[PDB]
Write an enzyme that holds these catalytic residues in place. Sequence first.
Site, PDB file in Angstrom:
ATOM      1  N   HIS A 178       0.753  -1.200  -0.001  1.00 58.11           N
ATOM      2  CA  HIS A 178       0.211   0.070  -0.118  1.00 58.11           C
ATOM      3  C   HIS A 178       0.814   1.169   0.031  1.00 58.11           C
ATOM      4  O   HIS A 178       0.227   2.282  -0.170  1.00 58.11           O
ATOM      5  CB  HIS A 178      -1.007  -0.060   1.027  1.00 58.11           C
ATOM      6  CG  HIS A 178      -0.711   0.711   2.338  1.00 58.11           C
ATOM      7  ND1 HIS A 178      -0.667  -0.065   3.597  1.00 58.11           N
ATOM      8  CD2 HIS A 178      -0.270   1.941   2.637  1.00 58.11           C
ATOM      9  CE1 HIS A 178      -0.240   0.808   4.666  1.00 58.11           C
ATOM     10  NE2 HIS A 178      -0.234   2.088   3.997  1.00 58.11           N
ATOM     11  N   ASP A 197      -1.086  -7.064   2.658  1.00 55.48           N
ATOM     12  CA  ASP A 197      -0.230  -5.752   2.474  1.00 55.48           C
ATOM     13  C   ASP A 197       1.423  -5.859   2.693  1.00 55.48           C
ATOM     14  O   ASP A 197       1.692  -5.829   3.717  1.00 55.48           O
ATOM     15  CB  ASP A 197      -1.003  -4.708   3.060  1.00 55.48           C
ATOM     16  CG  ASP A 197      -0.256  -3.378   3.423  1.00 55.48           C
ATOM     17  OD1 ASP A 197       0.192  -2.853   2.337  1.00 55.48           O
ATOM     18  OD2 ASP A 197      -0.689  -3.034   4.483  1.00 55.48           O
ATOM     19  N   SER A 215       3.772   3.324   8.381  1.00 54.08           N
ATOM     20  CA  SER A 215       3.397   1.843   7.572  1.00 54.08           C
ATOM     21  C   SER A 215       4.683   1.561   6.953  1.00 54.08           C
ATOM     22  O   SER A 215       5.620   2.209   6.312  1.00 54.08           O
ATOM     23  CB  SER A 215       2.697   2.445   6.194  1.00 54.08           C
ATOM     24  OG  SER A 215       1.190   1.865   6.324  1.00 54.08           O
TER      25      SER A 215
END
Lengths: 251, 10, 36, 4
Positions: free
Chosen positions: A43, A99, A197
């Site tokens: 992502h 992910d 992230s």
Amino acid sequence: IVEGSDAEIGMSPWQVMLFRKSPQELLCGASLISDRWVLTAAHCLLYPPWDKNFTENDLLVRIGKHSRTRYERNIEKISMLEKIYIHPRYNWRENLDRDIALMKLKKPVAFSDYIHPVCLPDRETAASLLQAGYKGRVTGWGNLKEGQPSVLQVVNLPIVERPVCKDSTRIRITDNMFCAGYKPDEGKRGDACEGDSGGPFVMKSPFNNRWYQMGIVSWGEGCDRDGKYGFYTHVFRLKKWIQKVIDQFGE
Amino acid sequence: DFEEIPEEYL
Amino acid sequence: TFGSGEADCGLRPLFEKKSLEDKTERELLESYIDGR
Amino acid sequence: XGVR
């Protein structure tokens, strides 16, 4: 990272910075699994909803950092990605299932006091440490508030029971994810947040004292909200995909 | 606030 | 890389290698109902 | 959810 601390020098030698050439900017976190391979959240690359779709040429990988912003002159090393590999079944459409993504750097990185790979867990390490109650540690240079830190931040979070995890959201939780954070009663906080992230969720093994990468910071609702948890890619559940590409694309 | 980076990198 | 990142993987040059503990690693290990 |  929300409610965390300033990492100590060389506390996380596997932390990488996913940095955008132009504008020059921090994309996400990542982790060094070897001298030629980096691990991140798919992502951070690809996300059609936001018109996100970075190529090998749109990014720079920076290993050895402490400072968010300054160019740490004889400590850090910048690399050019060679290849990008996104899980073929990553679900950007419904829940960010799978992910994960791998990065092949153009030339190997030399290890140093501040640059050293993290170990990928084996079936048994996974099985003995991945227990609700057990704490893991997250790192990043992401938002401090659901703002932009000076130095790398650290936070230790307990792992939460599948069920508590499922009932805190409306999103469909697959077997490739795990959530973490303290319970509101626990009255202790912390979480990952925008920009976090791709960073590693790590655990120290009490059998051989090695740092293991169990999860990848993936998504959450807001940042450090009572009754809400951080969601992570389950690195072990996808080890066969990882194994499988390191020896085709050949690390 | 990002410091630039050696151009040998860009 | 392989089931356990490099080979000298997860041993921090500035902590593990000089037998030095980071300021909150104890927190972690104690939770595993006290590690090694 | 917020994809991080």
